[PDB]
Amino acid sequence: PPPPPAPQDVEMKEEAATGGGSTGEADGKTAAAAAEHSQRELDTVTLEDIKEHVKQLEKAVSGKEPRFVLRALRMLPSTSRRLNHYVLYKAVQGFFTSNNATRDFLLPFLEEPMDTEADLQFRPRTGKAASTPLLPEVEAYLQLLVVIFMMNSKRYKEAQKISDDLMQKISTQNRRALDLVAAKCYYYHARVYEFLDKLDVVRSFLHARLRTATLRHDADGQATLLNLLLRNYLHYSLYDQAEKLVSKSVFPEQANNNEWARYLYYTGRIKAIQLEYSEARRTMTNALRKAPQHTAVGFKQTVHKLLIVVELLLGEIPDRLQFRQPSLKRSLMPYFLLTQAVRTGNLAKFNQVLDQFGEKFQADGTYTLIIRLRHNVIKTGVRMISLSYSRISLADIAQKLQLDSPEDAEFIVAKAIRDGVIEASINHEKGYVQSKEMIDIYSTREPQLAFHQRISFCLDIHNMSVKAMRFP
Amino acid sequence: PKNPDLRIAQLRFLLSLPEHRGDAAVRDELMAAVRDNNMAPYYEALCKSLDWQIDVDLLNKMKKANEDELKRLDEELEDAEKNLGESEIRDAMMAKAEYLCRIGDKEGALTAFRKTYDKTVALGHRLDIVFYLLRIGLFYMDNDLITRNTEKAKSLIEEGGDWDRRNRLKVYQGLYCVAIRDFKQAAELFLDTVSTFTSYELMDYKTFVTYTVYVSMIALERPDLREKVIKGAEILEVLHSLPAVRQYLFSLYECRYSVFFQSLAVVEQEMKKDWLFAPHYRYYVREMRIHAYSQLLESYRSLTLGYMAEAFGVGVEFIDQELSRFIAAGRLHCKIDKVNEIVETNRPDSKNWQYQETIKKGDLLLNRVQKLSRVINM
Amino acid sequence: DKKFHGILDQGEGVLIIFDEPPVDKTYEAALETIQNMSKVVDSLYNKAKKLT
């Protein structure tokens, strides 16, 4: 009896205030494209995942559903009668019995905010009402003989988007929330389609909703639909990466600084798999630092596990565990064991490391490191030599890299220059590889080019800041 | 005697860490494991050494009698708290903490320290008991008590008694305050050595000045170093006392090199052979080698390495492989030429390094500004 | 000892004599200003996050 009533209060009041203020903002002002309660949906990314998972069988949350699905609200007297009915639909939990809507009363409850003479002028209340059945069901994480019910509720949510496409779409811009809803549902729905085979019908309606946007509206929905396309495009990533790069989808722009990070991660892996490493490293580092708000959120453990993989494919050697965290130090242990081998030149120990932990490397989604990595087993070494010796000979490099034949030792140099690892040139009168130095970085108009972009971005921050201001 | 109780850690680390290669030092620790130590860890060495025989007999026999001597003034306070002063007087454990923290084992002596922390609010005895607790943390290499209570020792009791208690907060050097980072904090605390006469702690003030002159090499190259170690009366006095360490200093200050390498080997003879080798002195030897190569390589634009070999010692190919490691490590900025035996140095002018630093710092600041802009206003 | 502002040349026996670079004092103050501004924006992030 102490566990029930306080969730019954705070988890009545947060969403009562959210629904009331969302309807009041979306109708009182027409400029509610980015309302205050939009951040409330950000709270719903983090609230209900730790607030309640099951319907709280000690008479707490099972009564929240039939009250919040009984909404008629014709005018002010019907809404006031709903406020009067709130006391009884509140006390029915704590006094007698919360009704057992045990994982099934979500399908005939679609017409429940149409029963008892309901009018639907606020579409986002129906969007939140279609968002609610995933709270005791897909946020309970069971996935046992239950899949068809979330697919049915998602078809009802699709019918809600058809209602947003056909029934009174007079500049409501509710899709700017609904696509965010089509974020969260179609996350775990994706997990459902992760459990079964390829999501071809999801591919078709994802493309259809991707081109349903842009011409209609464009704010943070097309980015989410693009990313939800591209993740399972990258699942069976066979030849569609050329399609994804020729997919003109750099549009995203504002993405609350979180979705843009994983979009950068996805296109970084696409560009990393196609031998272009130097362009991949900068966008990998950009995606790593874009949203590091919390430590080891799963995303960091994977972008950090791709980052110095592509950096070791480039040739530069950082140590991996320099951000020792609760789930960084012990999760990157064979990662550190592999990155210790590239500084050395032992191939047998590296092969023993790979054969010892090849199952974990296949678990990381990084099958194809080895098919290129042996090239860097020589290449990194010669760049270190090209960093150490400004003028190296032709015969000393044979014993400085244990490359046996002097012609074989002097042939990697005939590739590393051409793709570009070292400025040095070779001449066949001495057999000496020698490089020059750069002094003109500050002497020429190199700093002005970077400074113009920095100045433009910094001064435009002031304009964007002042453009959102005082609202008396 | 909690102030002479650091004999426990001192001789227990004088044997127990080099006990893998200490023969006579086992016999040295034999008449101090039984005769004067805290408690049951006098057994503990049988997990490393032989089974032990005789210490089971006497050490229990005194200790229960000492527990029979632990009635002491407790019962005398029970017949002496009849006076209604403070419902207490300075007779009992508050004046009996010397046994229970000297002879008490840390699993119970930590609770004894907490018991005598429930005590008078006088700052002097409180600061003394905190220094006793810091030494008790250094007894068993706990590495958590010497982290937690040092903040209490330095900051929390910093309301009085200063400018003369500060020569007892010098334990924050070699302790969890100053780990193997033998650098600016540790050398700054060690350079506040305005004293000659002994104050226990590490024993044998010559060892303190050798520790200070060892941390001075990793402290500074020569920004005003000649005043702080070379031109000082007491440090030159103990340098007159200790000849080989004076040779180690003057083979670097006079820039003689060569024999400096020999002194490094002599330093190796006590780099790991002391007690404090459970962390490695590799970040000292490599740092000294890089420091010596930096002071040689300065004022020589095009130096042949044949001169460098005779300047530092032997090992032309050793010089080559050492520079090949150290240049590509990132430090010691020069560009060795394998042919023509020239080691040419390049140094960045002070407009390009400043440009790179401004670009990097401005990049992280603009990223932070854009993140803060995205936090508010959606 | 920073008494003389030149650099020797060892194996050629040449004493290179040259001056010292002046100015480069704006950039140091700029770098310290940017670090101090990082402290300022840290405090601003704290103020913004406390009351949302």
């Binding site: 920095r454 910094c458 002031h462 800041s465 959102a468 201001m469 | 508010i376 206003n377 | 501004m37 103020k47």
Partner: peptide, 30 residues
């Protein structure tokens, strides 16, 4: 460039000051 950088954080300070002192005031007033 440093002038633009020293201007932007002042603009951001004014923005978050206005937003906090507005939202708390409308929390009181409503």
């Amino acid at each position: 460039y440093l002038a633009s950088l020293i201007r932007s954080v002042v603009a951001l300070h004014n923005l978050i000051n206005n937003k906090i002192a507005n939202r708390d005031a409308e929390k009181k007033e409503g």
